[PDB]
């Protein structure tokens, strides 16, 4: 009667202790991965593997968008990430590959100037280094995308008509080994 409950008690407590562990670890893993991808010079190269599958999940509406890992303008600069719609968003829904920029809440924001006002250049690399698709934009100092973060992420903004889909879904040099490379360069003028 007491022999059973004693073992049972231990059982529970043991199962609980084991759980609070995997949670912190699943967490720590995510942290390590993020650190592995970050840069601190405003230049970021994002490799998106399993393009075919991710390309489908977007057409089938299962997974419309994907965020990229975060990167920075400098060791203690702004925090930013990218977001892509493999089958278009807004004026690009179903016809283009829509790509956006995202200002994030960083650890040093209180030491930075707001609103964010740096030029941003986005590229879809040609793995045949012949013709990289490129586009750029300057932030609208009045938009709420470039205002100091109250939330983890502000509203994204960028290029809804960044690149035509057909320019992928055929014989091209942007998709090699079922993966594409997106590149972003944040102009550092005045920083």
């Amino acid at each position: 009667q007491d022999k059973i409950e004693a073992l049972s008690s231990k059982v529970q407590q043991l199962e609980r202790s084991i759980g609070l562990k995997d949670l912190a670890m699943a967490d720590l893993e995510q942290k390590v991965l993020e650190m592995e991808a970050s840069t601190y010079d405003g230049v970021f190269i994002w490799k998106i593997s399993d393009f075919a599958r991710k390309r489908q999940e977007a057409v089938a509406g299962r997974i419309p968008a994907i965020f990229s890992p975060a990167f920075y303008t400098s060791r203690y600069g702004y925090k930013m990430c990218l977001r892509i719609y493999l089958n278009g968003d807004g004026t690009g829904r179903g016809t283009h590959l829509s790509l956006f920029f995202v200002v994030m809440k960083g650890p040093n924001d209180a030491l930075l100037r707001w609103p964010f006002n740096q030029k941003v250049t986005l590229m879809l690399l040609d793995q045949n280094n012949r013709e990289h698709v490129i586009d750029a934009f300057r932030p609208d100092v009045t938009s709420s995308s470039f205002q100091r973060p109250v939330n983890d992420m502000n509203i994204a903004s960028g290029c809804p008509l960044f690149c035509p889909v057909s320019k992928m879904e055929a014989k091209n040099s942007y998709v090699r080994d079922d993966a594409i490379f997106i590149k972003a360069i944040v102009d550092l003028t005045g920083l």
Partner: peptide, 10 residues
């Protein structure tokens, strides 16, 4: 473009 302004996702 000079400065195409960015557009918000939607």
């Amino acid at each position: 473009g000079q400065v195409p302004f960015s557009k918000e996702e939607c």
